[PDB]
């Protein structure tokens, strides 16, 4: 019954081809994660949503056969995604609701509107650094704009100091890469954990108006989050700032630089920016695979069975171009697509609580970019953009652009 097992390429050489093969193998495809670990992937939309709201599908790693049997090495480069420490991400039920509420409450659409002016300030400061670089030479818009801006917005929300950014960057590049030697993995996990522990100890004795301090202050407060849950939660929040928000900005520029008719309409005001962002989230999503869930008993998925104790990944890149959900134009980027009920942010109880923040950041960064630099284009052919060796995220090595001369519109 199952089509041939798909091995996810550790080098991410052909993400679009892999995505199309996952869709054809759906709704439940056998796959191999790098390091040789067999799991199932849900690769169609309607079945992903059903699985993500099924209480028989859990985050409890002791349910996983492969873990119980000793076949997942602790120095697997994906260990940090497959077995993260206790936090809202790794529990279900009432534990989950306790561990989520405060963070979700700080990040509603309204609490996030109040960060707008602070985000506008950091965006204009990043733009002044661009335009202050040597005119006419290519710039790497990822390292000079798309990386630093979301890292600053998220650091400021959580009160991380800028002196910690260089080591965070280096550690996160190892945490996400398939090429981190197993022998390096243990010390990377210890370093990340020691660095977040140190940040949380400092905030305890030196509060700020930042969300970490608010998590700490719900202490004399029916006990609420343990020290370890706060540290693990901080780590999880800050990993977004080195990953998904950067990718959304990069992928929006890449979509616009390859669809010149829509580009023109967007810079006009005939298609709104919000729609461009939503269609990028659907069509070229920042998170290719969401790790990882486990079946507490056999589950029907289409005509297949997800067996008890097996692992499940959600293949969002694949299912973002699902014709059953969006019709026969599902394959194409169309920024006016209107029912666009993608699940780039997940679905069910673990649905991204930061989604409104990421929309607000990209919705400010991107108009400000192209208002200041209305002839922005890629300095390389679009086909020469390449993915980093990060099997679960859709990230580019560089986004070389010609800014092409400031102001106006
Ligand atoms: C474009 C940006 C982003 C994308 C695409 C994204 C995507 C995701 C997805 C798919 C999940 C679900 C994981 C699962 O079901 O196992 C998730 C969870 C999460 N995201 Fe986001 N995310 C983004 C930005 C952010 C931001 C800015 C924050 C800031 C706080 C954040 C915090 C979280 C947290 C804490 C969870 C765990 C929620 C839970 O388990 O209840 N993310 N994200």
Collect all residues with Cβ–Cβ distance below 8 Å to 68 and sequence separation of at least 6: 62, 309
Instruction: Give the span between the Cα atoms of 119 and 173, in whole angstroms.
Output: 25
CA-nearest residue for atom 9, ligand 1, is 345
Instruction: Give the span between the Cα atoms of 240 and 128, in whole angstroms.
Output: 24
In short, whether 237's Cβ falls inside 6 Å of ligand 1 is yes
CA-nearest residue for atom 15, ligand 1, is 350
- Token digits for 299? 């589950």
In short, whether 245's Cβ falls inside 6 Å of ligand 1 is yes
Strands 400-402 and 377-378: antiparallel
Quick one: which of 93, 83, 6 has its CA closest to 42?
6
Query: What's the 135 CA to ligand 1 centre distance in angstroms?
Result: 37
Query: What's the 326 CA to ligand 1 centre distance in angstroms?
Result: 23
Collect all residues with Cβ–Cβ distance below 8 Å to 196 and sequence separation of at least 6: 231, 232, 234, 235, 238
| Residue 70 burial by Cβ neighbours in a 10 Å radius (0-12, 13-18, 19+) | exposed
Structure-token match 């059903």, residue found: 50
Spatial contact of 43 and 2, defined as CB atoms under 8 Å apart: no
Quick one: which of 112, 25, 120, 109 has its CA closest to 313?
25
Backbone angles phi, psi at 387, to 5 degrees: -70, 140
Spatial contact of 230 and 85, defined as CB atoms under 8 Å apart: no
How many C-beta neighbours within 10 Å does residue 333 have?
19
| Method used to determine the 3D structure | X-ray
C-alpha gyration radius of the chain: 21
CA-nearest residue for atom 6, ligand 1, is 345
* Residue 7, helix vs strand vs coil: strand
Q: Report H helices in 257-326.
A: 260-268, 273-283, 316-320, 323-326
CA-nearest residue for atom 41, ligand 1, is 350
| Residue 183 burial by Cβ neighbours in a 10 Å radius (0-12, 13-18, 19+) | exposed
| Residue 258 burial by Cβ neighbours in a 10 Å radius (0-12, 13-18, 19+) | middle
In short, whether 391's Cβ falls inside 6 Å of ligand 1 is no
How many C-beta neighbours within 10 Å does residue 105 have?
12
Q: Report H helices in 159-243.
A: 165-176, 185-205, 211-217, 227-241
Total structural domains within the chain: 1
Quick one: which of 35, 39, 42 has its CA closest to 9?
35
H or E segment and range at residue 357: helix 355-372
In short, whether 202's Cβ falls inside 6 Å of ligand 1 is no
Collect all residues with Cβ–Cβ distance below 8 Å to 353 and sequence separation of at least 6: 100, 103, 104, 107
Cα 268 vs. chain centroid, distance in angstroms?
29
* Residue 110, helix vs strand vs coil: helix
Instruction: Give the span between the Cα atoms of 188 and 118, in whole angstroms.
Output: 32
What is the stated resolution of the deposited model, in angstroms? 2.2
CA-nearest residue for atom 33, ligand 1, is 352
Instruction: Give the span between the Cα atoms of 149 and 245, in whole angstroms.
Output: 9
Quick one: which of 10, 34, 20 has its CA closest to 320?
20
In short, whether 158's Cβ falls inside 6 Å of ligand 1 is no
- Token digits for 236? 């999880």
Q: Which of 212, 229, 251, 354 to mutate to test the pocket of ligand 1 (most atoms within 8 A of CB)?
A: 354
Q: Which atom of ligand 1 is nearest to the CA of 59?
A: 16
Collect all residues with Cβ–Cβ distance below 8 Å to 36 and sequence separation of at least 6: none
Tell me if the bond preceding 17 is cis, omega within 30° of 0.
Answer: no
Collect all residues with Cβ–Cβ distance below 8 Å to 276 and sequence separation of at least 6: 252, 255, 256, 262, 266, 335, 366
Query: What's the 248 CA to ligand 1 centre distance in angstroms?
Result: 13
Query: What's the 345 CA to ligand 1 centre distance in angstroms?
Result: 6
Query: After which residue numbers is the chain interrupted with C–N beyond 2.5 angstroms?
Result: none
Q: Which atom of ligand 1 is nearest to the CA of 343?
A: 10
CA-nearest residue for atom 20, ligand 1, is 352
* Domain assignment of residue 291, given as a range: 1-409
Provide the β-strand partners of residue 306: 299
């Amino acid at each position: 019954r199952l089509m041939t097992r798909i091995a996810l390429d550790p080098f991410v050489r052909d993400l679009d081809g892999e995505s199309a093969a996952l869709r054809a193998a759906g709704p439940l495809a056998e796959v191999e994660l790098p390091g040789g670990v067999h799991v199932y992937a849900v690769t169609r939309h309607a079945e992903a949503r059903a699985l993500l709201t099924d209480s028989r599908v859990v985050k409890d790693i002791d349910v996983w056969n492969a873990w119980r049997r000793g076949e997942i090495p602790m120095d697997w480069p994906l260990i940090g995604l497959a077995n993260p420490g206790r936090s809202m991400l790794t529990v279900d039920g009432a534990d989950h609701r306790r561990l989520r509420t405060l963070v979700a409450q700080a990040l509603t659409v309204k609490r996030v509107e109040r960060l707008r002016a602070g985000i506008e300030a950091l965006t204009n400061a990043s733009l002044e650094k661009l335009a202050a670089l040597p005119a006419g030479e290519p710039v790497d818009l990822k390292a000079e704009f798309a990386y630093p801006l979301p890292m600053n917005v998220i650091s400021e929300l959580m009160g991380v100091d800028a002196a910690d950014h260089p080591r965070l960057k280096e550690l996160f590049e190892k945490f996400f890469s398939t090429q981190t030697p197993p022998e390096e993995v243990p010390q990377m996990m210890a370093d990340l954990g020691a660095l977040f522990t140190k940040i949380v100890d400092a905030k305890r004795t030196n509060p700020g108006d930042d969300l970490t301090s608010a998590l700490i202050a719900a202490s004399e407060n029916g006990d609420h989050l343990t020290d370890e849950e706060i540290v693990n939660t901080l780590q999880l929040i800050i990993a977004a700032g080195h990953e998904t928000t950067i990718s959304l900005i990069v992928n929006v520029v890449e979509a616009l630089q390859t669809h010149p008719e829509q580009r023109k309409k967007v810079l006009n005001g005939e298609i709104g920016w919000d729609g461009v962002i939503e269609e990028t989230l659907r069509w070229n999503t920042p998170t290719s695979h969401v790790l990882i869930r486990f079946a507490t008993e056999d589950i029907e998925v289409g005509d297949k069975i997800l067996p008890k104790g097996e692992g499940l990944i959600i293949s969002f890149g694949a299912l973002g171009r699902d014709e059953e959900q969006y019709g026969p134009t599902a394959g194409e980027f169309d920024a006016t697509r209107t029912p666009n009920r993608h699940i780039a942010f997940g679905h069910g109880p673990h649905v991204c609580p930061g989604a409104a923040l990421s929309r607000l950041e990209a919705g400010i960064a991107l108009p400000a970019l192209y208002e200041r630099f209305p002839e922005l284009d890629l300095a390389v052919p679009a086909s020469d953009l390449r993915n980093k060796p990060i099997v679960t995220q859709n990230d580019l090595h560089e986004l070389p652009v010609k800014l092409g001369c400031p102001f106006g519109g």
